[PDB]
Ligand binder design. Structure first.
Ligand code: CDL
Ligand code: PC1
Ligand code: 3PE
Ligand code: 3PE
Ligand code: 3PE
Ligand code: T2Q
Lengths: 171, 48, 105, 172, 345, 80, 98, 140, 318, 115
């Protein structure tokens, strides 16, 4: 019955990353500590609003922060990161345990020239708390007003008038 | 030996999955934006 | 139901996985989850006679999410009209509809 | 493609029809094996593999036992086939033709919620989780051990009782 | 049969209907039905005679077909509206095929041709179980979905069950088939009122059960399986003729016996819904049901058929049967109409 | 009884081993101090996204960042 | 999906038709029953995968369990029938007419 | 189609008599086909041709019964000008039973069928007049 | 490219089947104090080609009592499955990566029995039927323990995939923790192939040839090569599951080499066993698998269910 | 698609072999050659008669054991669950009940063949 609104092809245009997957897997553990704020704002805004149309500028900010991360990389430590993700793209599953000697060079490079530090075994896997300046939705499911329940008869219980009103029984 | 090796494998799995976690926001943004693009194209053509 | 033993002992042997809106493995979600949830929440505390009239909107949204007869009809009509056009030469699919597209990202 | 799952379902239908025509249980078990293979194929084409491989193994064992039994109880001097009896072959061909007719007349007079030859292959995998790690079918069937514990005890007791029951039935 | 096997099998028989009753999901109702029909068979075929084997076959095939149909209904109601248990928004075709299959199982007409045979081929203590304990789970299913059942179909089924039970038990010499047709008729009654009021079909079921169980006990006392055999009770167990006659007249539906109460309170609740014709026909044919019970009373108690030179021995000997429950049930099945208000609601 | 167990260990050792392994499988979980860690590990795995919460300003026990020293640590699994 | 379910329903109906319309042999009817089981299992699995409801996959496996138990007791009854009459024919168990 | 069998009550008796005849004949043929199915499945024949013979026999008999019923009913409604009278339907059921006897070659079946079908048809007319319900919906 | 890979996986398997017949004959000869083929070619490397060519040059038989359809389908299926079981095998990289590869193996193998069944039934000869029923018994015997052994092993692998066993054995064979299961699996693979001491499906001393007795040159060759291919297949399975070749991602060729060495060892062991032992009675096979292997198999399944728990050694899901 | 490709390639290889086996060689067909083989002499009957089975009970049991295997196979996934005690207990109960059924059959002499 009602129309469905959709953004325009320009309202949803960004500076895309256009970067492969092994490279992202190489840089993820550092991209988690350095963009947690914006990433989590976007994703909370996503689960809370359940609409990919209300939560779009946050995604553009996510893309921007990722681009800035990868530029901080491309400026200082392009070559170790290159070695790392090239070694890591060879495996049929892009495993870390096959490129440990290059991972260490990359992490030392960043620890030195950018102060970054690699997350530990279970830090990214947990629940943080993000502070946003957006209000809680009132009805994210857009549900209608629930029907009115049936009134509960009130009153103390008392025997039946003349007992069982069966055919010819006196009780 | 199998105990030790499977424990280290669990740890490596934690690592891979944490990488996936760090990356899921970007993928979600891209996927939503792309679905909206496809739907708007199909809308323009359904209008033509 | 006939012998509500469960509801007496306060257990759940067969009732925690009846409908799609129930707890699934690893907190996944069956499709039409929200429609089913809203139908159930509307039909709560009023009975099945009222629910057949007062949760009709919600049940129909659910039925459409699950079976999708109307999306099917709509896309079929669209394809039919497009085939008519192409037949009588009044339409040409744009590039992004013929494989040649800008593949974002 | 696009005609794939429909061809699978049609082959399953023909297998079940040739089964229902009741030839010697040898060829019936053959048709049942073929239908189970097709069912596996289609279940795999809908997303799930564990259930398909499962049903396939199960019916293979079952038809093994059924072969062993029919060679001992359900045999004849001249076992019947689909071709043996002109009437059975004729009704088989007739059933194929009637399936064709039903499909081609429902596409025309009926709506598209049942059979839509135009629009086929568009409605197989309605929704999916593109970023997903834990969607294998065996997760559900393993829920039996953790969540759906009732189905597990139920089936296990069914099998226990079945052992005792078949023993008692076969006692001479 | 060893006690371990007996334990497993009887526990399974008992468990089957319990799961069906105590379950919210239809699939588990189905597995309960299956437990029942898988565990009951060895108790039929235990005697190991051709009649027992063919009774077992006729029972198994029928119940398996009906179970597959019920399963199809459940699976369609799952494909539609994505839940297991039925709902108001469910296809009448599904509901009606479910009802038909449940009738097939119960043995209602015209799905009854297998019950008389299956009951004639087996011993009596199993016929008792078959006709009393195995008719509940189906009725549980039907009582959980009574608002959704079509009244046309159940009413046609009910009048058919009544007519066929009467006409069939009318010319039976074997007692087991008489009890089978009595079951068919009383199930027709149970079902004729189910959508309007299912608190009355449970009443009729309880009454039919407490009525048929002691009849079967009597038959098992002297392993009586024919009219000519029970005709010999005046020489073997004349202390049973009173209870026999009263239970028969009650089963028929004669006042002042509590076998008339189901008939009466069902006719009432039907005419409260303007079902004059159905109740009329049902009563007029319950009369025919009563007819052969009366012929049987003649044969057994109200006259004395010839006996044999050997029953003198049975007179010499002693007897440990029956137990306490026969008298209890036979008294609470004839002399309890005065308490009808307590029975009805 | 020892003689019965002995003549069985000599004659039918396969059933002896079967029952013994049955009992050990049923017992050792009650015995080991590394049994509690199975569920802890299967819980530590992030098969899903750790959906964040809104900073109402009353979540002192909850962290603002992965590398913020708050929440469950996995050291017990890093050195096990 | 809809065509698949229509064809599987038609297949169940054909197998039911076979089960109802006996021939000399009984094992053929047992096989038709197994075919109905197959149809229903497939329909249920397809529905659960189309709905992404991984909490209902434990259902079809139970279907298979109980179907195979039914088949087992059917085969046992078949054994007894063959021992009695020497064959699995249905026209031989017609003595309960009285 | 049910609109067909309901066309019987679109006009009162003594009208569209031929239509009533056709409708009642079709209904009789229906019932005869049902009975023949049940009589060939159970108590089968020695030959398929003999089974088809039995089918046609029962069906033509039922059709003739329905024909006479409807025809005589509408004729009596046309002659004595009492459309709302169960007595016309009694006469019709009686002619139908007399038919049933003619076919079976039994005067006893003729009399019994008359006195039973007449009662049944008269009660059917009474139910259509006084608005009875045969298979009513649960209302309480 | 994929078709070229199909060729590089198929034609070598058939050449290996042929030279496996060769090695069988020569090993059994030297064990029997004789030589084995040395005349046809240098040390006999042309006897298999001679046999095959001669067979496919002979008059096949279309008897009068046979169901020709199944009579012809059965060998087709036998060979097809014997060649299809080789596709999901990692050496160390498979041609078809299946998550449920183990179940594919199980199902295809349990299906290869219907070739024997339908052949023996179609042939319509008593010895053929006897071979078919013996195959029925053999399967009913071994198939129960096969899957439970395999599950008990996989409960430390974490999946039914054949490529996770490589990382599982990355440090140590699965024979050490599962050598009982390895022994039982070895004998059960010995039975799956209808191979001595379980050559009951074609027992020449009781049943002239069993299900082959009416089959002739070409189809018989198909049956025979399917047998001698499934042999190598099951050896490869044993040596991918319980024995672990060296996997260094920069060196899969070493993996293939060691895989081949171990497969040759296990196959030569099959031949050794054929030469060393008499033949069972097909009831004793059932009694064995149901009284010594199944109880122990259940006990070990429970043991390996518990071991990951009271050791915290539960494997990962990918 | 590749699995289909490989399997069809194998179908075609087998069928080619059979074609060139049935059409390449010279044939000379006659009844005494095409007749069944029963060790030099003529069959006394058809091979399509009831061949009694002495392990029918063991086959029936094999069906149920195959189902129990089907129920045991999801363990590789059931061990990834948080509720580990429940999985352990249920697996142990299942295997124990299976073994008890087998033991009852054994003792009552079901695994032994009718003679
Ligand atoms: C003998 C008793 C032995 C004495 C021991 C107890 C001592 C004592 O003080 O008891 C007094 C005790 C209580 O007296 P009360 O409460 O002070 O005063 C009574 C009131 O008038 C109020 O009492 P009521 O008389 O008005 O009755 C109350 C109740 C009573 O109704 C009942 O529940 C049952 C009453 C027993 C009858 O309902 C009725 O009014 C009667 C309903 C009529 C239903 C009868 C239908 C019979 C159908 C035919 C059956 C034929 C026999 C059974 C079938 C077997 C096959 C033939 O009364 C009795 O027990 C006697 C009952 C009288 C029977 C009526 C005969 C008709
Ligand atoms: C899936 C099963 C198919 C179910 C539908 C039946 C379709 C085939 C029916 C045609 C008649 C076949 C028949 O029964 O003939 C008997 C024959 C038995 O041999 P025969 O008795 O016909 O021998 C005839 C001899 N000549 C050739 C000289 C005339 O068996 C078959 O042909 C059918 C076997 C079933 C195989 C089904 C799988 C086919 C695989 C693809 C190829
Ligand atoms: C429904 C109406 C049936 C029409 C009457 C036909 C009677 C009939 O053929 O059914 C019986 C038949 C078994 O017949 P049979 O015992 O083999 O004896 C030889 C038959 N001249 O039974 C059968 O042939 C089984 C039929 C089941 C398969 C039906 C699918 C048909 C495809 C359309
Ligand atoms: C001549 C007049 C022809 C018109 C007949 C119309 C009757 C329609 C009523 C339903 C058919 C009942 C037929 C019958 O009475 O039983 C016949 C059958 C025995 O067959 P047979 O002996 O060959 O025929 C005797 C006829 N003189 O024996 C049986 O069929 C008994 C089983 C009948 C069960 C019918 C249940 C119907 C249920 C209706 C709801 C669905
Ligand atoms: C024709 C008469 C002769 C018939 C005999 C033919 C030989 C039969 C061989 C036995 C096959 C039985 C087992 C069923 C096929 C195996 C299914 C399978 O392995 O999975 C299908 C595969 C995907 O499987 P999976 O890896 O688990 O999913 C994740 C992939 N990323 O990818 C697929 O979905 C492909 C599914 C196609 C399966 C191949 C069947 C070919 C049939 C040709 C006929
Ligand atoms: C007293 S003993 O202990 O010594 C005793 C031990 C057993 N033994 C033995 C062992 C192995 C083979 C044989 C010869 N033999 C070969 C074939 C047969 N082979 C091929 C075939 C197809 C394609 C091939 O590859 C290619 F051609 F390239 F495709 C290759 C071969 N078809 O059918 C069939 C039957 C047969 O007996 C004999 C010797 C005697």
């Amino acid at each position: 019955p009602g129309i469905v609104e959709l953004p325009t092809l320009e309202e949803l245009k960004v500076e895309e990353v256009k970067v492969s997957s092994a490279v992202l897997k190489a840089a993820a553990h550092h991209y988690g500590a350095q963009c947690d704020k914006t990433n989590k704002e976007f994703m909370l805004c996503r689960w809370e609003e359940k609409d990919p149309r209300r939560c779009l500028k946050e995604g553009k900010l996510v893309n921007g922060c990722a681009l800035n991360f990868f530029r901080q990389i491309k400026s200082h430590c392009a070559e170790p990161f290159t070695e790392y993700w090239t070694c890591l793209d060879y495996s049929n599953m892009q495993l870390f345990r096959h490129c440990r000697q290059q991972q260490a060079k990359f992490d030392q490079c960043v620890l030195d020239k950018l102060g970054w530090v690699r997350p530990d075994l279970g830090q990214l896997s947990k629940v943080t708390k993000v502070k946003t300046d957006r209000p809680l939705p009132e009805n994210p499911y857009h549900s209608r007003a629930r029907p009115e329940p049936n009134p509960v008869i009130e009153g103390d219980l008392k025997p039946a008038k003349h007992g069982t009103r069966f055919f010819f029984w006196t009780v | 030996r199998m105990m030790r090796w499977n424990q280290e494998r669990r740890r490596l799995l934690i690592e891979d999955l944490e990488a996936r976690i760090a990356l899921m926001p970007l993928f979600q943004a891209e996927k939503d934006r792309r679905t909206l693009q496809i739907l708007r194209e199909n809308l323009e053509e359904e209008a033509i | 139901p006939f012998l509500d033993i469960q509801k007496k002992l306060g257990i759940s042997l067969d009732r925690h996985f009846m409908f799609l809106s129930a707890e699934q493995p690893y907190k996944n979600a069956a499709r039409c989850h929200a429609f089913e949830k809203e139908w159930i929440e509307c039909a709560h505390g009023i009975g099945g006679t009222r629910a057949k009239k007062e949760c009709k909107i919600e049940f129909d949204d659910f039925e459409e999410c699950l079976l999708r007869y109307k999306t099917m009809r709509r896309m079929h009509d669209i394809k039919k009209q497009r085939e008519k056009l192409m037949k009588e030469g009044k339409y040409t699919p744009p590039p992004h509809h013929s494989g040649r597209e800008e593949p974002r990202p | 493609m696009n005609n794939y799952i429909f061809v699978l379902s049609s082959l399953f239908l023909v297998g079940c029809l040739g089964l229902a025509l009741k030839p010697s249980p040898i060829y019936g078990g053959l048709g049942l094996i073929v239908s189970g293979f097709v069912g596996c194929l289609m279940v795999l084409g809908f997303g799930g593999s564990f259930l398909g491989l499962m049903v396939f193994l199960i019916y293979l064992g079952g038809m093994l036992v059924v072969f062993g039994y029919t060679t001992a109880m359900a045999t004849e001097e001249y076992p019947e086939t689909w071709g043996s009896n002109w009437l059975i072959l004729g009704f088989l061909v007739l059933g194929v033709i009637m399936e064709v007719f039903l499909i081609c007349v429902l596409n025309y007079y009926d709506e598209v919620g049942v059979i839509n030859l135009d629009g086929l292959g568009d409605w197989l995998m309605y929704e999916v989780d593109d970023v997903g790690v834990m969607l294998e079918g065996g997760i559900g069937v393993a829920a039996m051990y953790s969540c759906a514990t009732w189905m597990m005890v139920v089936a296990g007791w069914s099998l226990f009782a079945g052992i005792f029951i078949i023993i008692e039935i076969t006692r001479d | 049969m060893n006690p371990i096997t007996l334990a497993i099998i009887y526990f399974t028989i008992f468990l089957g209907p319990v799961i069906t009753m105590s379950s919210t999901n239809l699939m588990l109702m189905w597995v309960g039905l299956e437990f029942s029909l898988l565990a009951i068979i060895p108790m039929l075929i235990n005697k190991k005679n051709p009649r027992s084997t063919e009774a077992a076959t006729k029972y198994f095939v029928t119940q398996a077909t009906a179970s597959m149909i019920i399963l199809l209904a459940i699976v369609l109601n799952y494909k539609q509206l994505g839940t297991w248990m039925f709902q108001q928004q469910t296809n009448g075709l599904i509901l009606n095929m479910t009802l038909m299959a449940l009738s097939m199982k119960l043995g209602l007409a015209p799905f009854h041709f297998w019950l008389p045979e299956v009951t004639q081929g087996i011993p009596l203590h199993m016929g008792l179980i078959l006709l009393t304990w195995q008719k509940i789970a189906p009725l549980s299913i039907l009582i959980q979905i009574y608002p959704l059942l079509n009244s046309t179909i159940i009413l046609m089924l009910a009048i058919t069950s009544i007519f066929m039970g009467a006409w069939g038990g009318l010319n039976q010499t074997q007692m087991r088939k008489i009890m089978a047709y009595s079951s068919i008729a009383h199930m027709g009654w149970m079902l004729a009122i189910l959508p309007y009021n299912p608190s009355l079909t449970l009443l009729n079921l309880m009454i039919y059960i407490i009525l048929t169980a002691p009849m079967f006990m009597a038959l098992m006392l002297n392993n009586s399986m024919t009219i000519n055999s029970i005709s010999l009770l005046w020489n073997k167990t004349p202390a049973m003729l009173t209870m026999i006659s009263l239970m028969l007249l009650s089963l028929g539906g004669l006042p002042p016996l509590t076998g008339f109460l189901p008939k009466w309170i069902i006719i009432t609740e039907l005419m409260k819904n303007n079902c004059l014709i159905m109740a009329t026909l049902m009563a007029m044919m319950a009369l025919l049901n009563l007819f052969f019970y009366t012929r049987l009373i003649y044969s057994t108690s109200l006259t004395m058929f010839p006996t044999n030179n050997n029953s003198k021995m049975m007179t010499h000997q002693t007897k440990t049967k029956p137990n306490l429950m026969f008298s209890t049930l036979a008294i609470m099945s004839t002399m309890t109409l005065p308490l009808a208000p307590q029975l009805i609601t | 009884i020892s003689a019965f167990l002995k003549n069985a260990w000599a004659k039918e050792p396969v059933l002896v081993v079967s029952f013994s392994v049955w009992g050990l499988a049923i017992i050792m979980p009650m015995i080991s101090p590394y049994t509690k860690y199975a569920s802890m590990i299967n819980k530590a795995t992030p098969y899903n996204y750790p959906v964040p919460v809104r900073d109402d300003g009353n979540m002192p026990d909850v962290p603002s960042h992965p590398q913020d020293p708050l929440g469950p640590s996995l050291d017990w699994l890093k050195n096990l | 999906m809809p065509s698949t379910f229509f064809n599987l329903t038609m297949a169940f109906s054909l197998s039911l038709l076979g089960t109802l319309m006996f021939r000399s042999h009984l094992m053929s009817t047992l096989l038709c029953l197994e075919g109905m089981v197959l149809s229903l299992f497939i329909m249920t699995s397809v529905t659960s995968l189309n709905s992404n409801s991984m909490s209902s996959m434990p259902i079809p496996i139970t279907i298979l369990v109980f179907a195979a138990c039914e088949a087992a007791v059917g085969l046992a009854l078949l054994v007894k029938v063959s021992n009695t009459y020497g064959t699995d024919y249905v026209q031989n168990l017609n003595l309960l007419q009285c | 189609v049910k609109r067909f069998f309901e066309s019987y009550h679109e006009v009162p008796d003594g009208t569209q008599c031929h239509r009533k005849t056709y409708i009642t004949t079709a209904l009789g043929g229906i019932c005869g086909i049902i009975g023949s199915a049940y009589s060939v499945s159970l108590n089968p024949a020695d030959s398929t041709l003999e089974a088809v013979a039995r089918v046609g026999r029962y069906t033509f008999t039922a059709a003739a019964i329905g024909a006479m019923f409807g025809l005589t009913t509408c004729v009596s409604a046309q002659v004595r000008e009492k459309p709302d009278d169960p007595l016309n339907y009694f006469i019709g059921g009686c002619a139908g039973g007399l038919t049933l006897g003619a076919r079976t070659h039994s005067y006893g079946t003729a009399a019994m069928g008359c006195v039973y079908m007449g009662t049944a048809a008269a009660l059917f007319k009474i139910g259509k007049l006084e608005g009875w319900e045969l298979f009513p919906t649960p209302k309480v | 490219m994929f078709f070229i890979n199909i060729l590089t996986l198929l034609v070598p398997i058939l050449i290996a089947m042929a030279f496996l017949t060769l090695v069988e004959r020569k090993i059994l000869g030297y064990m029997q104090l004789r030589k084995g083929p040395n005349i046809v070619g240098p040390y006999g490397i042309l006897q298999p080609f001679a046999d095959a060519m001669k067979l496919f040059m002979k008059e096949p038989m279309r008897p009068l009592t046979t169901s020709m359809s199944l009579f012809i389908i059965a060998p087709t299926l036998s060979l097809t499955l014997a060649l299809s079981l080789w596709v999901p095998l990692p050496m160390p990289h498979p041609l078809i990566n299946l998550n449920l590869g183990i179940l594919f193996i199980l199902a295809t193998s349990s299906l290869s029995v219907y070739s024997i069944l339908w052949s023996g039934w179609a042939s319509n000869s008593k010895y053929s039927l006897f071979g078919a029923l013996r195959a029925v018994a053999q399967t009913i015997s071994y198939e129960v323990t096969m899957a439970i052994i395999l599950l008990s092993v996989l409960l430390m692998n974490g999946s039914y995939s054949l490529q996770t066993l490589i990382t599982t054995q990355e440090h140590m064979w699965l024979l050490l923790p599962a050598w009982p299961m390895a022994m039982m699996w070895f004998i059960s693979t010995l039975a799956e192939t209808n191979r001595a001491p379980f050559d009951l499906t074609e027992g020449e001393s009781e049943l002239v040839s069993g299900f082959n007795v009416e089959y002739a040159a070409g189809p018989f060759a198909l049956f025979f090569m399917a047998e001698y291919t499934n042999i190598i297949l099951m050896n490869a399975l044993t040596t991918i599951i319980f024995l672990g070749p060296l996997y260094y991602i920069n060196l899969p060729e070493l993996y293939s080499t060691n895989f081949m060495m171990e497969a040759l060892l296990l196959s030569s062991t099959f031949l050794w066993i054929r030469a060393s032992y008499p033949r069972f009675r097909y009831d004793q096979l059932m009694h064995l698998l149901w009284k010594n292997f199944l109880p122990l198999t259940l006990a070990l399944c429970m043991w390996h269910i518990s071991l990951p728990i009271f050791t915290a050694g539960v494997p990962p899901y990918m | 698609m590749n699995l289909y490709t490989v399997i069809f390639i194998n179908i075609l290889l087998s069928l080619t072999l059979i074609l060139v086996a049935f059409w390449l060689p010279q044939m000379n067909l006659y009844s005494e050659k095409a007749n069944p083989y029963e060790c030099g002499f003529d069959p006394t009957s058809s091979a399509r008669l009831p061949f009694s089975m002495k392990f029918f009970l063991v086959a029936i049991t094999f069906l149920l054991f195959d189902l129990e295997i089907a129920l045991l196979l999801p363990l590789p996934w059931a061990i990834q669950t948080i509720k580990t005690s429940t999985m352990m207990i249920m697996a142990f109960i299942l295997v124990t009940i299976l073994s008890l059924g087998l033991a009852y059959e054994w003792t009552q002499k079901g695994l032994e063949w009718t003679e």
